[PDB]
Design a protein around this ligand. Structure first.
Ligand code: HEM
Ligand code: HEM
Ligand SMILES: Cc1cc(N)nc(CCc2cc(CC[C@@H]3CCCN3C)cc(F)c2F)c1
Ligand SMILES: Cc1cc(N)nc(CCc2cc(CC[C@@H]3CCCN3C)cc(F)c2F)c1
Ligand SMILES: C[C@H](O)[C@H](O)[C@H]1CNc2nc(N)[nH]c(=O)c2N1
Ligand SMILES: C[C@H](O)[C@H](O)[C@H]1CNc2nc(N)[nH]c(=O)c2N1
Ligand SMILES: [Zn+2]
Lengths: 416, 408
């Protein structure tokens, strides 16, 4: 069965056959679309030898196809080797080549990621020999240095040991490797990043001396082999930050804003051939709107629209003045200007969405499809003047994949 | 099976049971979501449809299982066995139309759903008659700029050979002509229709904002051209409250958004001609009509007049111009006292409407892809609102364009 998507701006129609290789479920049915649910049951992640070899076999079939060795003696022997290692040891180990392939294809298959044109240029750091939280700190430091590269950002992922019985998990408790603390005040107001208040409290309880400023980089909280997590401060010279100024508004610097340069997601689960890598930090570079729209202007985040509009002296009485929309653009101009001025890699939403359209068309041509989540691909400002708004998209889940997992502090069994 | 939807900006969680009543299909499966696809796809079938509708109608008036209910169910059952169709009582027709709007999961304006004015045009027989009903609709809905929601319902389909159709997509739309030199004058979305108008007899001004004539088809006959009287077409010249050069652009839009090419389904009956109208949300004109590349596409021209740095996309000059254009639209309509709602006000209304529907109905089908405005998405409350999309009936459905179908 073939399926067609149409771009209603260009009338370009593409044909998807790749959705036929889809295994996992969407969450939708014939009678309800769950397309806007943030965490469906299926996108989140306890696994026995029963279902593991079919998952291994499918991944290895995919791997050896991609290297033009399907049905080779190398292919058949590896299947035999994995089979015996599973029945003997109940799991198996990926080769280095398989791990790299798997991690790149997990990114390639991330239907909510607009930055996937870059998927083949991913630096994979094998941290599967790591055993302790200190060892994890060292691997993460090296990732942060390599990926930052003095502002010339490089995509990277660091992969810690896979889950075994679910009782010895490696976890990075931070949602992102670099994030600002958030503090709830007795008067109800929040200082810093409201998104991080719960995590900041865990860190403080674990013994972190909080500076209690508005832009305090949080410490790393690292769990190795299912032991209690441990606190580590990222070396400040490794944390690249950009002061935010506006190219025309000199008062903008006086808002005291900055942001870190490296977006590095650290709380997701990487699934490859039925193996679960529960600690797999990955990083790229920012699209401007992630900082300027969501981080600064979400009502539940830094929420600076009011103060920015106040200093612009906009008509703030009625919303029909679009003072909210006016300030949002300026703030997003400032983020982009500050990053480019400091020669820190960033991409605006116009460039990033045009690239993704080209990526997607290329993927239909060479791969038969490109799974894409329109709800997430369309940027959070100026939607319809980007070409993805007009792009029909098919969403389905391929493996290897990145999945959500529950926050560790809700599942962890504390040792003491 | 009793589903939850979270708003992530407020942590409010609503429980949806209404979707269990869903009847039609969504186009998705467990293996693939088609949430962003624009248009996914006898006597026996008719009575169950009628029963389901009459069941919900007599429930809404708290007469479920009453004498009158069973009597009406009996009477419609008899009419279908006899005539192979049936006719709605006026009260049922009004209910059905209001609920088709209530059920339109892509519409952000549905908080107003119960205040719809329904014009029963089922006694209509000719295109001249259709024209009369439509002029009355336009005048009533326009109301000197104090816009009022309205629908006019022409006779239901019978055998598919006697269809009533309005060929225009909207009662009021600007013409579009291809220029010999390559580009497009007027509205590019309306180039083929502007063709069929001329190509059926229209005398075009070949201007930029020429109101298209109505192309009315009654009882499946050939469609006929009618000019809407200009004094009924309320238009707003577009100026900016800060940029005096803005007026020089020569932009205007019409005040009445009036969809005329959809199909209204009630209790299994199909109303192929059912023009309906409300009032604009500001982004419909300014973001889509003016700035879509496939439309009037004035962005580059406006940015030049603002003297913005158009060398690189990262100066966000398109975003800056886009905001100003939409400030102007709202300013112009408000100054002329023509009803319009900005996208902040309308989405806040829709959140309140969802809360109302979940509380008094058990849910509210909603299509996030269409509810979220085409600018400033994440600073409106609907962006952070999970939504369950499902198809309830009565409903508005899309239908094939008539010129592809009409046995001429
Ligand atoms: C290199 C430049 C990259 C850019 C510009 C980019 C951009 C984005 C953006 C804007 C989102 C939307 C999420 C949000 O708004 O919070 C996203 C999602 C995502 N990105 Fe990328 N990204 C990049 C690199 C990467 C890399 C290196 C990986 C993994 C190896 C990755 C994996 C993902 C995944 C898994 C999601 C989905 C998150 C979810 O399902 O909730 N991205 N990306
Ligand atoms: C009164 C103020 C109203 C407002 C502000 C409003 C707003 C909107 C908007 C912004 C859309 C998105 C579609 C697009 O972007 O082109 C839409 C769709 C729609 N509206 Fe409403 N509307 C209003 C009244 C009505 C009325 C009176 C009806 C019918 C009785 C209606 C039925 C619909 C339907 C059926 C759709 C979606 C068509 C589809 O499925 O593609 N609307 N509306
Ligand atoms: C590598 C990279 C590059 C880039 N440019 N941006 C990112 C961040 C994108 C991103 C976000 C989230 C969580 C968003 C959270 C959860 C729900 C809503 N929000 C609160 C999870 C991810 F896996 C992810 F990749 C990553
Ligand atoms: C009553 C009313 C009030 C208001 N404020 N706006 C409207 C117009 C919105 C609208 C659009 C469309 C088609 C959109 C077309 C077809 C494909 C994509 N697009 C180009 C169908 C509708 F039923 C509709 F209601 C109507
Ligand atoms: C491809 C995509 O479905 C298409 O561009 C849709 C997206 N969302 C929309 N939303 C609204 N309100 N109106 C539209 O015409 C569209 N078009
Ligand atoms: C409810 C809704 O799905 C939620 O707000 C989503 C919508 N789209 C998004 N898109 C991106 N890129 N990031 C997000 O956090 C979200 N949030
Ligand atoms: Zn779906």
């Amino acid at each position: 069965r073939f399926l067609k998507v149409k771009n209603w701006e260009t009338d370009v129609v593409l044909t998807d056959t790749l959705h036929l290789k889809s295994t996992l479920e969407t969450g939708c049915t014939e009678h309800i679309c769950m397309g806007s649910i943030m965490l469906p049951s299926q996108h989140t992640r306890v696994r026995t030898k029963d279902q593991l070899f079919p998952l291994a076999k499918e991944f290895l079939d995919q791997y050896y196809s991609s290297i033009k060795r399907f049905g080779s003696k190398a292919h058949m022997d590896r299947l035999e080797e994995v089979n015996k290692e599973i029945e003997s040891t109940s799991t198996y180990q990926l080769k280095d080549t398989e791990l790299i392939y798997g991690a790149k294809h997990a990114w390639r298959n991330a239907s909510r990621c607009v930055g996937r044109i870059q998927w083949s240029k991913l630096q994979v750091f094998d941290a599967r020999d790591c055993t302790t939280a200190h060892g994890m700190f060292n691997y993460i430091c090296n990732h942060v240095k390599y990926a930052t590269n003095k502002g010339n950002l490089r995509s990277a992922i660091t992969i810690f040991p896979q889950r075994t019985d679910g009782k010895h998990d490696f976890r990075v408790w931070n949602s992102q490797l670099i994030r600002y603390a958030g503090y709830k005040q007795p008067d109800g107001s929040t200082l810093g990043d409201p998104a991080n208040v719960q995590f900041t409290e865990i860190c403080i309880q674990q013994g972190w001396k909080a500076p209690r400023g508005r832009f305090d980089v949080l410490p790393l909280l690292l769990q190795a082999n299912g032991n209690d997590p441990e606190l580590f401060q990222i070396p400040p010279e490794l944390v690249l930050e950009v002061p935010i100024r506006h190219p025309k508004f000199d008062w903008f610097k006086d808002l005291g804003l900055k942001w870190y340069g490296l977006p590095a997601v650290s709380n997701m689960l990487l699934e490859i051939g039925g193996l679960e890598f529960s600690a797999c930090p990955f990083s790229g570079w920012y699209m401007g709107t992630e900082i300027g729209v969501r981080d600064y202007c979400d009502n539940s985040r830094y929420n600076i629209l009011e103060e920015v509009a106040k200093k612009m002296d906009l008509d703030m009485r009625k919303t029909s003045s679009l003072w909210k929309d006016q300030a949002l653009v300026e703030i997003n101009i400032a983020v982009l200007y500050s990053f480019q001025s400091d020669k820190v890699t960033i991409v605006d939403h116009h460039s990033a969405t045009e690239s993704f359209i080209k990526h997607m068309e290329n993927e239909y041509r060479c791969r038969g499809g490109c799974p894409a989540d329109w709800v997430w691909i369309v940027p959070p400002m100026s939607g319809s003047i980007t070409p993805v708004f007009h792009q029909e998209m098919l969403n389905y889940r391929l493996t290897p994949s990145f999945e959500y997992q529950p926050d560790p502090w809700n599942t962890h069994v504390w040792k003491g």
